[PDB]
């Protein structure tokens, strides 16, 4: 029971990773490729994450 | 006579000359499980890897057929690696004793690459694995080469 | 209760729209392009 | 002629010398020379650190000054034992530890100069006793790359330096570098006079006087006890509640403890009401 | 060993796995079997190591018949060589651990209990050495020592 709380605490060393930009899609290309513009910026060509 | 029998039955070395003849008839081992992790190559620890485990496999054995069919992999092995490696084949032929050393006279620094000083390092570490676990001249042998060994490169498997 | 067939027809016109590189010139063109791309 | 996984070992004052000057240089990337130890190829121990002053040119070996150099190891020489500089140590704000095409000009140099021309990336990201965002990185050569760049003779090791991995900035300058594993040295008295100037000094330790303790206790005391007079309403409702379906009811309010603790230690001042004191 | 298995430490808990595999050697206790295969699937690339090696040295001495999971985990050393995305250190000792098994053609085996009980002094020292081999690669060498063999010698006459 002591392992799982501290692992918990453990799992919060997740908390420290950056986060990541918010954009919105304009369109979709084919090759795991889409067209997001940044929230702030402009238009950039992504690559897709397998999931 | 009896004197000479008593003094051989209490030193065992025939009876474990007699189990390297059990492995060497009797080995169940299969080279396709030995091919088939050499294929998913690393090209890093898995070469290290492959090596001692071909030698668990083939201890006493002597068959170093995994060794024998690749050059090339084997050679890709680092200066170090190699020298874990020679030590490896002491490790299969570790049952011949003293028929072994002659055999790894085919194996010695001088017959194979006076370059390689790691090499030569792990050939004196292989000779050691063969006679481990016994007390002979050889191992007086051993200590004699160690004197005129290097301090270092050769005494780091001597 | 035809309805089914003509069902299946859309739901199928909708599979048929979803499923609707070199060895080394692409690969080339893949390393030379940023992972992120900036279209101006 | 092959790398391994190499220990590089911070002693205590070259570690702490490295924060307190790049946190005053934050803004301007200030750089430094490390006065490091080559006692083997293995082992890597910086026993001191010195700071370069600031220098306008920058974190580039340009910036570094030979004259500086030896007259501060003339006075090393004169008082205690000099070390040959391993290398150059310096903080990029920015980027935690990350590698630039100006830090390998410079630490190439390093290279040309000794051998192993360790480079430190120490920076603003902190915490308190916990945080060592520093890191060090030696480049690996273009001819090298060929060969395998780090042969390792022992797994664990290798393992103790899998567990850093790489950073994902890192990542991205990483080919023609290779990450080398940072251990504190060892730190015996060291040790002790921080952990003596710990729980003693650092921590509220004044001894003779260390054990507000009768005055705003009692406030306290029934403020806790309100909380949970309106928290316990929770467990009431979970033990009425048929909860044949397991649901959320706001359970272990506790402060029990805290509780337990204030009025228990206030209570110990019987102890300097008839002991400490008469 | 089953309490220190589950610990916060990566080392604690392979060194659990590689205290369990060594304490029952060729022989194994079912519950030991079960206790490996969590280990296996654990986060840490250094406790799923020192898991497939132990459970190499439980491996020698058994067959599929004796315990159900020996095919699985010989699969299993299979599946993490052949798979890339396994990491590098994590396979490390799994084809190691292949080797462990098939040692001496699967004939030779761990123990360091003598039938008369006396202790096997060249299987102790292996299988410490063998612990410090993760410290030290050539020292799986010294393990190579300690593989009593499981047939038997019936000679009438010595010659
Ligand atoms: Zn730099």
Known sequence: ?51 | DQTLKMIKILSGEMAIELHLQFLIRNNNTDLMILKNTKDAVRNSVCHTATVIANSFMHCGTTSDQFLRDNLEWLARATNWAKFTATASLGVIHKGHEKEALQLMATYLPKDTSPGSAYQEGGGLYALGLIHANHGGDIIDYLLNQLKNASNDIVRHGG | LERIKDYLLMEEEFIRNQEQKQEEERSKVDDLRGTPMSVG | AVDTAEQVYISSLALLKMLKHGRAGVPMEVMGLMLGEFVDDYTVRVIDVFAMPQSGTGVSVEAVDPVFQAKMLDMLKQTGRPEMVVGWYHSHPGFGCWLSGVDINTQQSFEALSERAVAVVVDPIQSVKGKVVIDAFRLINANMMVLGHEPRQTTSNLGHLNKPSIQALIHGLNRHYYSITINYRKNELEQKMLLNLHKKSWMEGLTLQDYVVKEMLELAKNYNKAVEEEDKMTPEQLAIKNVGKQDPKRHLEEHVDVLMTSNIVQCLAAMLDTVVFK | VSLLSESYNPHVRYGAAMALGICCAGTGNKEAINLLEPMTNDPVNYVRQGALIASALIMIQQTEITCPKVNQFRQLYSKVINDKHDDVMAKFGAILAQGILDAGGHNVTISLQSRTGHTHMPSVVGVLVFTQFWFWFPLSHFLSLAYTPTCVIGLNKDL
């Open chain 1, 1 to 51: 029971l002591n392992a799982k709380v501290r692992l918990l605490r453990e799992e919060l060393q997740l908390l420290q990773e950056q986060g990541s930009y918010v954009g919105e899609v304009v369109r979709a290309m084919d090759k795991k490729k889409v067209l997001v513009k940044v929230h702030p910026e402009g238009k950039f060509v992504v690559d897709v994450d397998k999931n």
